[PDB]
Amino acid sequence: MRPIHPGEILAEELGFLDKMSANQLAKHLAIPTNRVTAILNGARSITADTALRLAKFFGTTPEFWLNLQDAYDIKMALKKSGKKIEKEVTPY
Amino acid sequence: RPIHPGEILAEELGFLDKMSANQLAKHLAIPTNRVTAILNGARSITADTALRLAKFFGTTPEFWLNLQDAYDIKMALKKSGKKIEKEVTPYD
Amino acid sequence: RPIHPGEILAEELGFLDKMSANQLAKHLAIPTNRVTAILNGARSITADTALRLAKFFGTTPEFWLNLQDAYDIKMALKKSGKKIEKEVTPYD
Amino acid sequence: MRPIHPGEILAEELGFLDKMSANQLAKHLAIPTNRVTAILNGARSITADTALRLAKFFGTTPEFWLNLQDAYDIKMALKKSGKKIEKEVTPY
């Protein structure tokens, strides 16, 4: 399957919560609206700090959010270098 | 206890006829400086690195990224844990 | 720094929807008491356990036994390191 | 390949070193002759303490000797429970 940026999933969640805006979330998380918008647009990653804030707000684990980022990063890395890694890296 | 993934990598390397960072860097096809930085816990493991470690050590890429996440979370908690607990309003 | 393999196992478990020792014990088909002891660093990982972890986590069994060995070596050095250095004559 | 008990390899090494006896090695390592004999006969395992002593005497790493034990343990575990583990353990 295609890479799913965490911002995609975050957007879906916001929508379910009475169509919560980027500004609303930013205030709830106490972070710049720019940071939320960037994540929603897939222009920035979820850091550990953001994961902790999201976890506290949504009542999830921070691991959940970082694993979403990992999944996306892995798929992006596979698209960019997957084949080259198969040819380069010695299977021990 | 915050364990950097580089610490685990170092332990595993010790069982491969005491493999050096330079030798591992060759197997993974990445700069020696990147491997050394990771071993010293001065640099994080990216998805690209995780994929190469997975191929080399016969693991999943998630196994390594998970260790990085766990470390990142503990460092973030140490730095901003109390701040986040105070600033963030649980949606509930 | 002596890292018990149970510490690494615990970190990895945190990313599987916060899996409990009992749940993992079911997946590995071993007693919960054995998993708990390992997590608490009160019991060593045997080859049998290493094989089940390898299957479950998608790693090699050596990956886990290596971590156990590294821990065992450091504990042995702490306990008898100076004694061994004094008592043992290098063949050379 | 069949399981190779470390004692088998130890025996071969002793033979090369002017047909060194169990007693001779035991004195060199400062351990009971019984312990050496038991290892040679495949009746006892190489512990971390023994690995450290062997490493100092033969000029190897302790990891080398423990990895020999691991290899043997894994193959023995596969013979005893390999099939059952394949049927029991959930591949995650």
Textual characterization of the structure:
4 copies of one chain form a homotetramer. With 92 residues, chain A is an all-alpha fold. The first copy, chain A, has a single domain, classed as lambda repressor-like DNA-binding domains (434 Repressor (Amino-terminal Domain)), CATH 1.10.260. The first copy, chain A, is built from 5 helices and no strands. In chain A, helix 2 crosses helix 3 and helix 4 runs antiparallel to helix 5. The two termini of chain A are 28 Å apart. At the A-B interface, helix 4 and helix 5 of A face helix 4 and helix 5 of B. Chains B, C: GO terms for molecular function: DNA binding. Chains B, C: Pfam families: HTH_3. Chains B, C: This is Virulence-associated protein I. Chains B, C: One of its GO terms (biological process) is regulation of DNA-templated transcription. Chains B, C: Keywords: DNA-binding.
